[PDB]
Write a protein that binds this DNA or RNA. Structure first.
Ligand SMILES: [Zn+2]
Ligand SMILES: [Zn+2]
Lengths: 89, 214, 97, 24, 200, 94, 133
RNA sequence: GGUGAAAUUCUUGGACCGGCGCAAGACGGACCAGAGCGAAAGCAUUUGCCAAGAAUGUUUUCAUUAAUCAAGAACGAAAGUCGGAGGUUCGAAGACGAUCAGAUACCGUCGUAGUUCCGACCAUAAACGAUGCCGACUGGCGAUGCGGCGGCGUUAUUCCCAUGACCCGCCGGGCAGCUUCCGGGAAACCAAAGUCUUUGGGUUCCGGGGGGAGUAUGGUUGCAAAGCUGAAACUUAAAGGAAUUGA
């Protein structure tokens, strides 16, 4: 239907092309449904900013503002596991 | 105006009594003066003591570094904490047209000391051999490296810090690896490149006194 | 035409070489193409060694040597006077003696 | 004219040409 | 009014038969049904509350206590965290890097939550709308539509007035200026585009 | 190599997929191996291990989740609990 | 100084950091935690030019010998360093002359080592990569 | 600290130095070389997993199923753009200090963007072997990798075969020198840059004196910078390649 505007066609011409391009990436990720790591079903939607809910197993997870997992979160979780393992062994 | 050579005192350093020369040197240290502690200050010091002056009939290219543990009045005690072959030896036995093999492994002894051992091997060209290169394939290197992994694990895990350091003093592990590897590829310059610790148990005066009095 | 079959550098197989700074002018040049030499110079000049030796406490057991890696690119290799230009059959040579 | 900086000058004459057509 | 989500955590009272309910700042990764542990013997896991003394160096923490016995005072906004740098067991002090880049010596008995605050990246998305800005501050306070002092009259602002819209005096103002005069750039050590990173 | 052995159970052996069918097989003695995905519910995982202890049968914890275990069984759907009735291959060892 | 017999020697470690701009000779106890002295070619000469020249290094070395002889230390081992790391692995000119004087002054010198920092590969090297002067 | 020689600058609030630790993000030295792998751009710490490939071997299998290729498509050094993570080291732009008649530069100290990872763009280089792919013929000598075959011996697993490793060769696929009146070439130089007038094995891309000009215009891609496709008018008798002796 569109060549490049995608999901930000709802804004028409009403903001800059670059601002619509930046929000295009974020609006795709904030409205996507992800696969739940707990039940395996692709029903992990966003309730509010930082709140992600699964409509099958009814699990609520604290995540990112627009994406389910922030890169800072993954690095910190991997680093804490390394620091914990160094303490134990 | 005031020379700081009087505000300090010298203590004599004694290694564990399992070497040939107990006396190593005299290291100055500041007086307590009611603020600092000379015993805690001397703790954590590391003296590097090669086998040339640690023994009298051993190799002169093996450096032994010792971590202080306790201070007995005018005396200062130490304990083996790591070793490294000299880099002037290092650059001299690596040459052109040859192959080197490393292997790093972390093994913990029963005493609770975690040790990271590095082993080094070099492929040996035979006496009659005339070919310029003497490479070992990726498949031979992997099994040779695995051999150093298994041999070092066996020789360290089941032995204490007492036994392991006594094994490394004649570099017996380096000779054992080379002879065992003669089946796949005889090797010419084989020793242990480095040994470092990672964790220590709680410092105990009884253990240190036993080592220094044995 | 090709002045050199080698095209100056020793790299005929691989595509790229990491650069090394020139000593005389500080210009980046590929290692294999640069004039690289090992220099061993006594710490003390042979004529001047004796003055130090006379004042030396040691029973003639100390002879420190200074070994420094040398790297010249080709623009200033000539200025140094190293690598003086060769004859037409001259180029095809080697170490020199 | 060195080869490269003749190319640079031709590019800069082209960029000026484009702006003239854009404003016209 | 708060970008960071909050976690409702239920504990068990050790002195009488009753369940307690606490409102924590949600570390990113925690989920409903998870068990969180608070104490000096708690393991080093995301969501647990530990004193910073028992934490190793390089640990990432959030909801950190400024002084012992508080209930979390630092690194509380979404996507923010503090880092443990080093300890001093003799004086019982710990150095921590704050989200502004500043470095602070705190008591090692201060507690913190392991991880980063959930809801990070909120500032990445452009607001894009006067209305979205309006809805943002309708939940916070009456501060949003900001008139410029140069657009005012000289009776309501030091920058107001003139036949042109100009400040007329340097906008850098001293620290000791009275309340009605301290407008513009208060105690500016410098002005203009930065070239690098500026810190004390 | 567990995935290759599971592949040969699907072609040649007998099996039940899904949690309700394995409980039936355990309680009537027809289950020889039970495989649990890594994201199996904790209560269900504990219950299966208890059923297997009473029936004296082995429990293997598959490395991946229900999406990957089902793919390992050749199915286009998630599998969380599965029981092997007849191997037909060399999965009897463990 | 320590209370030792005349038959033995007061031993310590000595590092000779060599560069093409200024040579550094420095002496401490075995571990090096406590410090005995430091002399360089910089304090020797008014002009910063001759901090790397041999003649200033000998005068600096004599400074080491006399001030350390005053304290009561005679025997010193040697550990050599170049600029190291990314810079050249070759010690500078201010190494032969400084070691010549510390040998002529009569101080005891024994084992010799090289503890120059030799990376597996350090980071990018200053300069950049093009043009000279 | 650094320069041919000097400095800006960090410095008695203790820099530099040596010792013990912690953190950061890059990169894997001497091994590592006319050696290997990939269609190219490219690829180097140990370990695990996934999928793929050349050569070899074969008395297995289909039996012409066959190679470059209009139109069309995918990957494609480095740099650059957008976006999100931290900036360890280097380092456009920029700043400061020396050198000269000027120095908008070389030298030194910082230093943003960049140099790092991730998603989408950008498709350029001396992407050079300045050297298309498939196929037959067309000297040799000393070597290297793989695989397969034969062996006097040396050596370790040991106590036998066997498994390793060195030496001698053979066979097929290679990256390759070196000499050589094979030959061709204008020569420089090359077993292909040969079998070419004694002219035909198949075929794609691509050139037609030098400029104008990789320009104008049209089309298309891109956020931009720019990329791909791409004339004409007019103007010139030379521009060029190799080699000869001097300077
Ligand atoms: Zn779910
Ligand atoms: Zn140069």
């Amino acid at each position: 239907r569109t060549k490049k505007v995608g999901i930000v066609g709802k804004y028409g011409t009403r903001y800059g092309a670059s601002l619509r391009k930046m929000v295009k990436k974020i609006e795709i990720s904030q409205h996507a449904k992800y696969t739940c790591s707990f039940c395996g079903k692709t029903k992990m939607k966003r309730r509010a900013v930082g709140i992600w809910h699964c409509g099958s197993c009814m699990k609520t997870v604290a995540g990112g503002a627009w994406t389910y997992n922030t890169t800072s979160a993954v690095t910190v979780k991997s680093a804490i596991r390394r620091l914990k393992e160094l303490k134990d062994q | 105006v005031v020379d700081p050579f009087s505000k300090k005192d010298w203590y004599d350093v004694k290694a564990p009594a399992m070497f040939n020369i107990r006396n190593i040197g005299k290291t100055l240290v500041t007086r307590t003066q009611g603020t600092k502690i000379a015993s805690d200050g001397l703790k954590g010091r590391v003296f590097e003591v090669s086998l040339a002056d640690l023994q009298n009939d051993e190799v002169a290219f093996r450096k032994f570094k010792l971590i202080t543990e306790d201070v007995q009045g005018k005396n200062c005690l130490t304990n083996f904490h790591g070793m490294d072959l000299t880099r002037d030896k290092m650059c001299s036995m690596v040459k052109k047209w040859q192959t080197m093999i490393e292997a790093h492994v972390d093994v913990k002894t029963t005493d609770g000391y975690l040790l990271r051992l590095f082993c080094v091997g070099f492929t040996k060209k035979r006496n009659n051999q005339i070919r310029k290169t003497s490479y070992a394939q990726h498949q031979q290197v992997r099994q040779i490296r695995k051999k150093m992994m298994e041999i070092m694990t066996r020789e360290v895990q089941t032995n204490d810090l007492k036994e392991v350091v006594n094994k490394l003093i004649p570099d017996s592990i380096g000779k054992d690896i080379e002879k065992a590897c003669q089946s796949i590829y005889p090797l010419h310059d084989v020793f242990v490149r480095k040994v470092k610790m990672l964790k220590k148990p709680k410092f105990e005066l009884g253990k240190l006194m036993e080592l220094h009095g044995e | 035409t090709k002045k050199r079959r080698n095209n100056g550098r020793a790299k005929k197989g691989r595509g790229h070489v990491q650069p090394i700074r020139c000593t005389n002018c500080a210009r980046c040049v590929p290692k294999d193409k640069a004039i690289k030499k090992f220099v061993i110079r006594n710490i003390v000049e042979a004529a001047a060694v004796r003055d130090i030796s006379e004042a030396s406490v040691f029973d003639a057991y100390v002879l420190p040597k200074l070994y420094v890696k040398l790297h010249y690119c080709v623009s200033c290799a000539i200025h140094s006077k190293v690598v003086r230009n060769r004859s037409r059959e001259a180029r095809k040579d080697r170490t020199p003696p | 004219m060195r080869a490269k900086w003749r190319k640079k000058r031709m590019r800069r004459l082209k960029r000026k040409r484009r702006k003239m057509r854009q404003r016209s | 009014g708060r970008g960071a989500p909050l976690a409702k955590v239920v504990f068990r009272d050790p002195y009488r038969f009753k369940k307690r309910t606490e409102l924590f700042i949600a570390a990113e990764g925690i989920h409903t049904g998870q068990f969180v542990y608070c104490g000096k013997k708690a393991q080093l896991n995301i969501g647990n509350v530990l004193p910073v003394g028992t934490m190793p160096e390089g640990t990432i923490v959030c909801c950190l206590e400024e002084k012992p016995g508080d209930r979390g005072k630092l690194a509380r906004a979404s996507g923010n965290y503090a880092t443990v740098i080093s300890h001093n067991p003799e004086t019982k002090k710990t150095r921590v890097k704050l989200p502004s880049g500043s470095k602070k010596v705190i008591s090692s008995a201060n507690r913190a939550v392991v991880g980063v605050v959930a809801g990070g990246g909120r500032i990445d998305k452009p607001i894009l709308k006067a209305g979205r800005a309006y809805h943002k501050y309708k939940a916070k306070r009456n501060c949003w539509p900001r008139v410029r002092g140069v657009a005012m009259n000289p009776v309501e602002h030091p920058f107001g007035g003139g036949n042109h819209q100009h400040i007329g005096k340097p906008s850098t103002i001293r620290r000791d200026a009275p309340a009605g005069r301290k407008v513009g750039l208060i105690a500016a050590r410098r002005t203009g585009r930065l070239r690098g990173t500026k810190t004390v | 190599s567990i995935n290759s052995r599971l592949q040969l159970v699907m072609k040649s052996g007998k099996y039940v997929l899904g949690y309700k069918q394995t409980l039936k097989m355990i309680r009537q003695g027809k289950a020889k191996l039970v495989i649990l995905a890594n994201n199996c519910p904790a209560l269900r995982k504990s219950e299966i291990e208890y059923y297997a202890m009473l029936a004296k049968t082995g429990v293997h914890h598959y490395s991946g989740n229900n999406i990957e275990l089902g793919t390992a069984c050749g199915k286009y759907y998630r599998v969380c609990t599965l029981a092997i009735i007849d191997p037909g291959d060399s999965d009897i060892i463990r | 100084g320590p209370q030792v017999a005349e038959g033995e020697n007061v031993f310590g470690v000595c590092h000779i950091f060599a560069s093409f701009n200024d040579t550094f000779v420095h002496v401490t106890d075995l571990s090096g935690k406590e410090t005995i002295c430091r002399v360089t070619g910089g304090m020797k000469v008014k002009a910063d030019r001759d901090e790397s020249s041999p003649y200033a290094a000998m005068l600096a070395a004599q400074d080491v010998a006399q001030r350390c002889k005053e304290l009561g230390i005679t025997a010193l081992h040697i550990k050599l360093r170049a600029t190291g790391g990314n810079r050249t692995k070759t010690p500078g000119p201010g190494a032969q002359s400084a070691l010549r004087a510390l040998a002529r002054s009569g101080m005891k010198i024994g084992r010799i080592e090289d503890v120059t920092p030799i990376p597996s590969d350090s980071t990018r090297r200053k300069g950049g990569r093009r043009g000279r002067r």
